[PDB]
């Protein structure tokens, strides 16, 4: 073979039919995947998961910098029971009995 750094990139990819499919998967079927050699690797997967959780938390959580928590007069179940622990207990003993 020739040296792979001397070889033209598109010629290598034309020769290889497997890594063609690897590129199509991440860069044709998506537009926001990182330009790293291995986007399916565990570091990337776990980073995506942590980013997902942090984004959803920042959006939905009750905080000092609230995005969605605003104009609250009738609360939902989770926030109601998280703020009013007296009512969670009463509503729960009644349910079990």
């Amino acid at each position: 073979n020739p040296p792979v750094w001397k070889v033209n990139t598109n010629e290598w990819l034309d020769s290889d039919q497997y890594w063609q499919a690897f590129v199509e998967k991440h860069h044709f079927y998506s537009q926001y995947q990182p330009g790293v050699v291995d986007p399916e690797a565990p570091q990337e997967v776990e980073a995506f998961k942590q980013a997902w959780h942090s984004r959803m938390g920042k959006f939905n959580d009750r905080s000092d910098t609230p995005m969605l928590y605003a104009y609250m007069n009738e609360l939902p179940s989770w926030e109601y029971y998280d703020l009013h622990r007296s009512a969670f207990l009463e509503h729960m003993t009644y349910f079990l009995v």
Binding site: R62, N73, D82, L83, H84, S86
Partner: peptide, 12 residues
């Protein structure tokens, strides 16, 4: 904003 053991009127 902070959980309390007291429930107001509107949230009764």
């Amino acid at each position: 904003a902070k959980p309390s053991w007291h429930v107001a009127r509107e949230h009764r």
